[PDB]
Design a protein around this ligand. Sequence first.
Ligand SMILES: [Fe+3]
Ligand SMILES: [Zn+2]
Ligand SMILES: [Zn+2]
Length: 744
Amino acid sequence: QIQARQINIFGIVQGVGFRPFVFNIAQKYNLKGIVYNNSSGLYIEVEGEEKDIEAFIREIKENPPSLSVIDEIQVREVEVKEYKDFKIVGSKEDGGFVPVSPDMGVCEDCLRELKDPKDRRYRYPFINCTNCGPRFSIIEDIPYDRAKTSMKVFPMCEKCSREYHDPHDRRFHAQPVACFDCGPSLSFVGEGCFDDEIKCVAKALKEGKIVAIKGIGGFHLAVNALDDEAVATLRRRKKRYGKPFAVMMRDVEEVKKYCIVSPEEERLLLSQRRPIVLLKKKGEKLAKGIADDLDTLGVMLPYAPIHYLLMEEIDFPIVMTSGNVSEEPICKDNEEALEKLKDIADVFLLNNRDIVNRIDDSVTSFNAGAERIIRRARGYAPQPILLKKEVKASILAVGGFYKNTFCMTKGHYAFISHHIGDLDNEKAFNYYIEQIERYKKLFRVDPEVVAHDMHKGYLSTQYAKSLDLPKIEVQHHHAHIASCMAEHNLDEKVIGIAYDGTGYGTDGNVWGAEILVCDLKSFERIAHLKYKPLPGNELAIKKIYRTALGFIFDNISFYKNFVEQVDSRELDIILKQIDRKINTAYVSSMGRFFDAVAALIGVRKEVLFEGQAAMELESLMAESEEYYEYEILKEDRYVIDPELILRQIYEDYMKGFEKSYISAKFHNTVVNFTYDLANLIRKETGINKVVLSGGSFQNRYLLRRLIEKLSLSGFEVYSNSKVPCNDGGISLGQAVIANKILEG
Ligand SMILES: [Fe+3]
Ligand SMILES: [Zn+2]
Ligand SMILES: [Zn+2]
């Protein structure tokens, strides 16, 4: 017997080698039929053995082409039609852009040619073809063409030229084609070294030195991830970091030794997008100082020819952290890196190919049955987000402050930028401004309106106000909810749960623990945490014991052991400044709530970076169904007093309960009261769609447990997946809100 199916794939499917893929996996499972493009995405007709079609449907479902963004797959039964063969058939929809693709990791064919001793490009560190290599990182302008890339200064040799022009070659119109004879080459700076440049880097790593490596999107810093001393000297030389290091490993087998790797996680690792994937550790096997006191590790695989070559010369994982002092934009030019990283790196691996657009490594993960991206950069940007509704007019969304991205709309596309970083330094600002001009140029966008955060002290806000265009201001947490709404094409009233550290509220106070009823044009504040004073504002976020004190300010005597640990003079002044309202904001913030908890139970008195106590509190928790009592009090809106929950936490602490146990109980309390609020709002409003966004949802337990709880009570639950739930996704939300305000 023979079985026949008709398959529709909706989403971004062009420009990603999807059709040649379908053709190949057709010859694989020996199937007959056709594939072609349509307006919605792709059309497939397939017939053959029942075991081949279910597997075909699985390969498309489980490992589709890396650069594709599949939104929906539909399968219907159809009558057998007896096809002779399989064909890639054309359509009026053929040649459907996007003009600029993300940078791509080395493809399987280039890998095999890199490792083939008989191949002219054997060991060539800049090998690429039509299906891989640098794209965005070297592109100045459009249409995509060598002359409009940093490859224009290299004249092609004969051998590369005929490959480029041969329509049946895998390097046909491969713009950055190269070989040893005509292409870029590597250089080694530092101490003398006789060998080839990769071997030198291997030697330097082996000796416990820091190597600055020029990759695709910029420079990165590497040491031997098994060498405690080398990791320690990098920690000392950055000195202002604290953040965990990402690590590069040679293959999935090596990852499975250090981390838990599910199939979806393996798909993200092996993807040509090649991101860092945050993974659960399997027992401490790496050096101290990589990712201490945390149960997760960011792992990436090789992505450029240089890494594959490096991997056969070393037998240890390597730290691969951004090439910057502190946290400013990473270096991109040779001379810029040699100066900026002089006190960090011992040696450098350079090359003579300009990086035009610097772009950081992406950082992603898998949780609650979907990809949850933390930092959307190399391999993802500058691919647009697909919108169901055509945008009325072109909007520039300037984003926010932390982990900034900007966003431009045109047609059915939201062109969100790659991760820019914190807009709090000259270097970040230039990078930002510069890249706005580049995106405008690459995607032919001329913005008519500007959307910005309500906060007046953001560089992004100041920039918006400095432009000569109508301005729409957007509340921070509304933009979080909306950013998720854009992903899932929602355009109706939802229950929006916006939990994060901070964002300017419409009442003038800090928000970040809000339940909103909102659509794309407006919102209503329905619920938040009871305001507590944050004495010293910014300082209290580093010294989180101050946040604790702010939360417990009207009930100091209850927390005897904790308050007696604080210097008496400081305590007096902290308590007086709250009374006199000096340098003190009032906050409704999930990030601060967590910080207070962390401080009270001796996890952390002071943090090296924002969110450290939040991440550690999550890592140390035990398995527990238990939780703390809470009262939902109805005032002007629905409010919960965090101090009443802190009371019980401190009690448990004083009785000698484990931090692991208390952390778990706290996590369940937030989940439980949030669920209870969501039910109250649904009961009043009739709204059954819930959106979860804001940085707090980077917490795996929080997101997972809440999606489960709400789904099991009939909620239709949505959270970020294509853009981050952190401030990296804000711009997308700003854009869709601005569009909706214009529309009517
Ligand atoms: Fe935020
Ligand atoms: Zn290739
Ligand atoms: Zn050549």
